[PDB]
Amino acid sequence: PPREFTQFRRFYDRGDLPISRNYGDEQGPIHWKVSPDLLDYHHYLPVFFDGLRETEEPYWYFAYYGTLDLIAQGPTKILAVVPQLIIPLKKDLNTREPEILCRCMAVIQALVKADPLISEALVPYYRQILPVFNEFFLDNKNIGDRIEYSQRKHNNLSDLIHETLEEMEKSGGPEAYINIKYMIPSYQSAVA
Amino acid sequence: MREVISIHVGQAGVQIGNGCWELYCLEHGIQPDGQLPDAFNTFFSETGAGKHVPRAVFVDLEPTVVDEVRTGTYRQLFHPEQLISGKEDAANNYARGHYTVGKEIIDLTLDRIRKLADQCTGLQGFLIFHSFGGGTGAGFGSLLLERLSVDYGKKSKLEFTVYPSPQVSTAIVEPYNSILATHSMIDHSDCAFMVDNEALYDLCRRALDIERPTYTNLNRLIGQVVSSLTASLRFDGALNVDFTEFQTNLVPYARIHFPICSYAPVISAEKAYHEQLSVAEITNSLFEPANMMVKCDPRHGKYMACTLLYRGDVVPKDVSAAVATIKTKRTIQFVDWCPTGFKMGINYQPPTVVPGGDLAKVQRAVCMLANTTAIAEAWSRLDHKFDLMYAKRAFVHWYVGEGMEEAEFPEAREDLALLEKDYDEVAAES
Amino acid sequence: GGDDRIVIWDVARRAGLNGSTATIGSTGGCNCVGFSNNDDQFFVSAGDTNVRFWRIDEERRNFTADNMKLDITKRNVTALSLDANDTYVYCGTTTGDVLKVHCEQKKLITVGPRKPIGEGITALQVTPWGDIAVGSGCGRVAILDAGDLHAITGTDLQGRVTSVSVVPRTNSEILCGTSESDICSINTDTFKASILSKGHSSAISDVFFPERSSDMFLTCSSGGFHVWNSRTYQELLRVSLA
Amino acid sequence: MFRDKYQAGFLNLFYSVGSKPLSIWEQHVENGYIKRLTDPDIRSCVLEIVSTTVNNTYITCPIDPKEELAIKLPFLVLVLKYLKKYFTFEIQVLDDMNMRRRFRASNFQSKTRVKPFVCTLPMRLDPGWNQIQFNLSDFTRRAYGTNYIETLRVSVFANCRVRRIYFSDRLYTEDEVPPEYRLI
Amino acid sequence: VREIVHIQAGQCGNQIGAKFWEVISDEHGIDPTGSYHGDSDLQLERINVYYNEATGGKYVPRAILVDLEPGTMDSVRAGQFGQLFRPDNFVFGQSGAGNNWAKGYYTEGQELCESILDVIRKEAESCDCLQGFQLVHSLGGGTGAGLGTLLLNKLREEYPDRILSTYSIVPSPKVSDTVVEPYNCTLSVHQLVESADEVFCIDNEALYDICFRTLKLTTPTYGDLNHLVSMVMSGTTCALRFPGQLNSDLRKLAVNLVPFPRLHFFIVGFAPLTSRGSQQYRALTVPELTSQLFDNKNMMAACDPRRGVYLTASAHFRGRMSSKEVDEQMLNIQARNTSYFVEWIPSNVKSAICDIPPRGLKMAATFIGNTTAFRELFTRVDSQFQKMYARRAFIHWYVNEGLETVEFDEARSNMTDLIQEYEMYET
Numbered sequence A: 001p002p003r004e005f006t007q008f009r010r011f012y013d014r015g016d017l018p019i020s021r022n023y024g025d026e027q028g029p030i031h032w033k034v035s036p037d038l039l040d041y042h043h044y045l046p047v048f049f050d051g052l053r054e055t056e057e058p059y060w061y062f063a064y065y066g067t068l069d070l071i072a073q074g075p076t077k078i079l080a081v082v083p084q085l086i087i088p089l090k091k092d093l094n095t096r097e098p099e100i101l102c103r104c105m106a107v108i109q110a111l112v113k114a115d116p117l118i119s120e121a122l123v124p125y126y127r128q129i130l131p132v133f134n135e136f137f138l139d140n141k142n143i144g145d146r147i148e149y150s151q152r153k154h155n156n157l158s159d160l161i162h163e164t165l166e167e168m169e170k171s172g173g174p175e176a177y178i179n180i181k182y183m184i185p186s187y188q189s190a191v192a
Numbered sequence B: 001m002r003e004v005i006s007i008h009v010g011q012a013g014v015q016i017g018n019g020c021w022e023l024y025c026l027e028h029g030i031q032p033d034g035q036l037p038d039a040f041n042t043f044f045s046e047t048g049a050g051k052h053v054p055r056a057v058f059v060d061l062e063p064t065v066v067d068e069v070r071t072g073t074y075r076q077l078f079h080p081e082q083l084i085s086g087k088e089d090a091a092n093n094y095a096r097g098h099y100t101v102g103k104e105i106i107d108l109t110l111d112r113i114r115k116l117a118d119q120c121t122g123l124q125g126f127l128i129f130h131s132f133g134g135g136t137g138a139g140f141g142s143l144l145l146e147r148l149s150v151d152y153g154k155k156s157k158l159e160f161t162v163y164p165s166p167q168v169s170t171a172i173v174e175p176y177n178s179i180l181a182t183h184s185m186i187d188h189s190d191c192a193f194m195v196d197n198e199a200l201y202d203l204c205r206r207a208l209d210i211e212r213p214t215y216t217n218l219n220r221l222i223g224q225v226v227s228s229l230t231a232s233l234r235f236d237g238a239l240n241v242d243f244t245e246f247q248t249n250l251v252p253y254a255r256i257h258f259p260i261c262s263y264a265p266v267i268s269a270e271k272a273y274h275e276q277l278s279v280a281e282i283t284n285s286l287f288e289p290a291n292m293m294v295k296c297d298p299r300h301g302k303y304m305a306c307t308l309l310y311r312g313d314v315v316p317k318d319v320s321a322a323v324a325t326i327k328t329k330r331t332i333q334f335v336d337w338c339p340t341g342f343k344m345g346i347n348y349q350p351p352t353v354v355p356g357g358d359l360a361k362v363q364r365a366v367c368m369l370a371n372t373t374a375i376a377e378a379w380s381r382l383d384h385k386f387d388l389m390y391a392k393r394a395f396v397h398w399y400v401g402e403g404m405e406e407a408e409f410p411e412a413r414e415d416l417a418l419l420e421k422d423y424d425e426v427a428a429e430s
Numbered sequence C: 001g002g003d004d005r006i007v008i009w010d011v012a013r014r015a016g017l018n019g020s021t022a023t024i025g026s027t028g029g030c031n032c033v034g035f036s037n038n039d040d041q042f043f044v045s046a047g048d049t050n051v052r053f054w055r056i057d058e059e060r061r062n063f064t065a066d067n068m069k070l071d072i073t074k075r076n077v078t079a080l081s082l083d084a085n086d087t088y089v090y091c092g093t094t095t096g097d098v099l100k101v102h103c104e105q106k107k108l109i110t111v112g113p114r115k116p117i118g119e120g121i122t123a124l125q126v127t128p129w130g131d132i133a134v135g136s137g138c139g140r141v142a143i144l145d146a147g148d149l150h151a152i153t154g155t156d157l158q159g160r161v162t163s164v165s166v167v168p169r170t171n172s173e174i175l176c177g178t179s180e181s182d183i184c185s186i187n188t189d190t191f192k193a194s195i196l197s198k199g200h201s202s203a204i205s206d207v208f209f210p211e212r213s214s215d216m217f218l219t220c221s222s223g224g225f226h227v228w229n230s231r232t233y234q235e236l237l238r239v240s241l242a
Numbered sequence D: 001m002f003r004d005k006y007q008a009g010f011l012n013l014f015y016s017v018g019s020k021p022l023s024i025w026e027q028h029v030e031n032g033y034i035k036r037l038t039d040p041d042i043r044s045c046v047l048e049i050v051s052t053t054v055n056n057t058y059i060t061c062p063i064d065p066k067e068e069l070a071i072k073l074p075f076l077v078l079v080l081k082y083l084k085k086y087f088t089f090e091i092q093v094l095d096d097m098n099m100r101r102r103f104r105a106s107n108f109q110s111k112t113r114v115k116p117f118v119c120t121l122p123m124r125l126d127p128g129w130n131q132i133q134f135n136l137s138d139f140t141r142r143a144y145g146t147n148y149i150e151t152l153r154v155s156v157f158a159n160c161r162v163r164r165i166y167f168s169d170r171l172y173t174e175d176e177v178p179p180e181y182r183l184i
Numbered sequence E: 001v002r003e004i005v006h007i008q009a010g011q012c013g014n015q016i017g018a019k020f021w022e023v024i025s026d027e028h029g030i031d032p033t034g035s036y037h038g039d040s041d042l043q044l045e046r047i048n049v050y051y052n053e054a055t056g057g058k059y060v061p062r063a064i065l066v067d068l069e070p071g072t073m074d075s076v077r078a079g080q081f082g083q084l085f086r087p088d089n090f091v092f093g094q095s096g097a098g099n100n101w102a103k104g105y106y107t108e109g110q111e112l113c114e115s116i117l118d119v120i121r122k123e124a125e126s127c128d129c130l131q132g133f134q135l136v137h138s139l140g141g142g143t144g145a146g147l148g149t150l151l152l153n154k155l156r157e158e159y160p161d162r163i164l165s166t167y168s169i170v171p172s173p174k175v176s177d178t179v180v181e182p183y184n185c186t187l188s189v190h191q192l193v194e195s196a197d198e199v200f201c202i203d204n205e206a207l208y209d210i211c212f213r214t215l216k217l218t219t220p221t222y223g224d225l226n227h228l229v230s231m232v233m234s235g236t237t238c239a240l241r242f243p244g245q246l247n248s249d250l251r252k253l254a255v256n257l258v259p260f261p262r263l264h265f266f267i268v269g270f271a272p273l274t275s276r277g278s279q280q281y282r283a284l285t286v287p288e289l290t291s292q293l294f295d296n297k298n299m300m301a302a303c304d305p306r307r308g309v310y311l312t313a314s315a316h317f318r319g320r321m322s323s324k325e326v327d328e329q330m331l332n333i334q335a336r337n338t339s340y341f342v343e344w345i346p347s348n349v350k351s352a353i354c355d356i357p358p359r360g361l362k363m364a365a366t367f368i369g370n371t372t373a374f375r376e377l378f379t380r381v382d383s384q385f386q387k388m389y390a391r392r393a394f395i396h397w398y399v400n401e402g403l404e405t406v407e408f409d410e411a412r413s414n415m416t417d418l419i420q421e422y423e424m425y426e427t
């Protein structure tokens, strides 16, 4: 599977906002040209989701942190765009590189926390998403009694799977667990 | 890695840029086509294969100067979007290049530089070049600095300008353009260096064995200082000095942010054969009022800060020995509230020679930056010349019809009076 | 010499030439120097964080010096050897890797082996078959490919290896030396070590014959005692308590 | 091409005044002519395109048949003088769905069928200089439904006098505009 | 039974730590790729202190490298022991500082924190006995100083009992490399005083001075200075790994040397040091070690103890020596210089011996002392800071970060209080 061409690069070359990285202010990693509240959510956010697949700067830095800021500031409006995010999200997971999936899981964890209704709307989309997780589930390494460094890269992909799956299980509701079983045989419920 | 973006505004700045990038590529081993026969990320960008592109943007309102670069040997290295050429010039009028003509191209320039800054993740400062007497260099540069201040905020904006010579002049309207540019520059510029062509002419004639130099020799001398100044961030050294470290050494006060420069040893390719050119010899030669390229005697004023950079075989001892030796000079005065007042940086990479150049095969060299009250000597010269123009309103009609309100001239005069008055209190001792 | 000076002598005239200083300044002392394979006027001297190239001009009876480009791989240097051609030079380091430097462009191009050898390289010589042989203070003699300096084979001996020599245009045997006063030869085919003559590592100050038989004599020395055979000059016992 | 070139305010594509107005433009002439002259109604230069067969006399941009334009602005404003004859022009645009789309208007047209490849629009003018404005984003979403994507090719046919073809980022009414980018 | 996790911020600090791992691996006999090929069985007695074993016979060191721009990490990977470090051990930011102390701490520090803490975290529950981390950083810069002070607070919060042993390089007061430095050092001192259990001060001016008094290196480089710092670090942590006859650890040294919680800044020194050619003439003995250790030309700190008085002192020895000879020296040099010992804190000197000396240097010693002379150091930076602060031009650089102007004064007030505390304690 070649690198399917990312729309975010085509939106960024002419119109995208997050270029601003300049501060004389008490602000975070990225800045916006305009306040995100005025922006629409059908055009910007799906493009941002597609940008996590970028591998070289400045595209991926803006796309990753832009997605985080948009999901944090505007959690009410994202419910409408939830169906449109499945396609670009499914593009990112199929890359299977041990770096993109870390970003995707961070976004997903930041996504389910926004609204229990959102996670209930993601139950039909589990089948479209989980097969990547169902592959990488058991990639941990045995070291015995001595030390793990990987977590400062935050790249121990298995541990990200466990917490993230626990997050959909809590917010998924009544029918999230049975769907997880249909995708993940080795999973066992953490409901209580 | 860590990046610096350069802009070359005006006829003077573009020619200065050509000499600098010629020196960089020779110093870096990069061919004019961008290929090779490290710290290249600081000044160049890699586009795959084996091609590199400088992080430079050339701005001028006349196409002839830019077209020379577009048709030169180095035309392949630069990117077409980097070179920006205007349609009609500012005609040595600050008003024409700031309000009427500058505003047509100001926003076109900003996008191209801002797009380039996205690629520079480790960017920690811009280099900006001016000519005070020029209309485009002053009129457009002042507006561009104002836009850059709000856009980037707390990013370093280093400037390197050509202050008018005390006696040698090229434009009659020079005093008007210089004062207006400084009034805008005094608030937005993080730090700005000054050089005058008259002292450069004297130094390149006395030290270098050239009977009749041109602007090319002067640009080569300027480029050596810039290359030595930026060599700290590119190559390993026994002491590394950063851009913010060049800033706060020299400018303990906001409005007193003006340093002066001098370089040594500037010796011809045949007279260097007869001397050692050790660290002690070059360290003493810097303080000589003949070597420094701003015609204001420091023996009339005082020293307020000094910074040294060593490139070559230089060593921790004889730096420390020379600094102690220099401190014993009673012809040199320091204020008591500046007891240390020095810095040195030590870099291992020797200075690079230039084919067809005017320098000698030196093994060690030193570049010096200092702040002094002596700059007030030239500021009164500019003020008096401006007063002669403005007493009889000899050139007001050109500027007023081209856009500013007349009330801005006394505003710039008052700002100059406060700035000179600020330097005077700093000169005093309590 | 030990005063950081290099002096060139003329064999035909039995007379010397101008001396010079091996160092330039912020380098340190000099440790080794060698000649090129195909140029009488070209020779390379080396020191800690300092590799220099030299060419001799026969008109003024002097020689110029050239320095290496500023690579950040700061190491001390013990020994050097040039390749079969003048294009490459190889340098050993105190810390265990061999540096490969291009003579034409004066730059380091690779560092090897990827798994270095203990306590640096104490002996180096390019084999006649275009390959690199090294010696180490740990006691291991290894061969590193001339291409990218990846280890192909290696054997172990006692003591700190101090000398490695190969007969020119020969692929059968390699001679090795030891700080234990051991003289050993390594067969290149089966890659096995053989010992020819042992010795004492320091001052010997006592000798004794057992009265029952005179074919053995014992000796004591600083570092241990030995048992030797008089009929055929070989040892049979070594006991050392440091 | 023009893709990353900075595009704000106005970006013009044709102007009758200059040493080579039809420099980036292409000419194909049958049973007619393309001429440039000074028009008394405005006391200024203008390009004149007249032919018996309007379908076989046109100008197009860019010159290269394989290449496409990359103008970002969504509004295209046309200034032309109506010669009381048959007139037509066409535009090629792209949409979200990645179908190449072509719009060709005409004055002798009858209906406005929008069959997939090429939309046709009947139009009527006022005898004299006109200021037709085309909102590409509004038109594309109104007819085909998908959003607007950057313009590929523009073609203008015979029987008209044209002196202004430029793009605007938004809909500008009169006098919020440089003094040259309007009618005398 | 004593495992230490080593943390390196700083362009300076990362280079120093890398040379330290060079020294340790040569001492232990470790291949720069981690495979054991040494010669002493005593090297594996307590190798677990500094190393991990990966399945495959490879040893990985307990090393954390902290930076904000990838340039230094790229240099470290180009280093000899770059493969020794586990590839995940390195982290680097994506927005540089340029020695801006406020920028690194406030904007970059918060983002960096959530990542950096968790090797400090997961080393703690898996380093086999945590009784202290170790941090090396620079005070004049912005990245190491600001981030190191911030992480020192989080280290104290998450790990209160574990000893936060810090080694810092003081701004050179005649000339240092950076000049945002007085602002940076002032703000870092307030953070360092309250949290860090032990702080050790090193000046580059003294290192160059020592090189030309003793080493006679006509032309030294950074490699020598960091090598000497590595020697001090090797001497400090040697007692934990190797036998001896009388040994003191970090907590013992804190008990033995620190009389009061805020009087814990210490000077460091190493002996013997000799020029490369004159070492043959010298007969290295215990009295030669004692004279070298206490001689002012060997102190690696820009503070003459003769201008002050001593509070507490410590001496450590490497190799096999007679304890009677050591304690014979410790009495007679304690009596010789009674003008330098405080009357009401006797027993200032402490003694220790470790069995295994480093390679080639048959007999070795490391000295750590406490003297009131520290007051000169804070006075110099305060004097430089005063007129710099008197015209607030530079704080607006730090204010734009989000740092309040009043933040500079509380650090200055704490600095003056720390100076006053050392002044009363002299009498």
Ligand SMILES: Nc1nc2c(ncn2[C@@H]2O[C@H](COP(=O)(O)OP(=O)(O)OP(=O)(O)O)[C@@H](O)[C@H]2O)c(=O)[nH]1
Residues within 6 Å of the ligand: B010, B011, B012, B013, B015, B016, B061, B089, B090, B091, B092, B093, B097, B131, B132, B133, B134, B135, B136, B137, B138, B162, B169, B170, B171, B197, B215, B218, B219
């Ligand atoms: N050292 C040096 N100074 C130069 C050079 N070219 C121009 N200058 C100085 O620049 C001053 C005038 O500025 P210019 O850049 O030439 O004029 P300008 O900025 O283009 O102004 P306009 O032409 O009206 O747009 C003169 O006083 C010269 O002393 C040069 O190549 N080297």
Ligand SMILES: Nc1nc2c(ncn2[C@@H]2O[C@H](COP(=O)(O)OP(=O)(O)O)[C@@H](O)[C@H]2O)c(=O)[nH]1
Residues within 6 Å of the ligand: B239, B240, E009, E010, E011, E012, E013, E015, E016, E098, E099, E137, E138, E140, E141, E142, E143, E144, E145, E169, E176, E177, E178, E204, E222, E223, E225, E226
């Ligand atoms: N002693 C020593 N100091 C160094 C070395 N490399 C850099 N430095 C110092 O590091 C300081 C600058 O550090 P900086 O770039 O701000 O990074 P930081 O240490 O994280 O703050 C300067 O004062 C240098 O003198 C080295 O090899 N040895």
Ligand SMILES: [Mg+2]
Residues within 6 Å of the ligand: B010, B011, B060, B061, B062, B089, B090, B091, B134, B135, B136
């Ligand atoms: Mg001009």
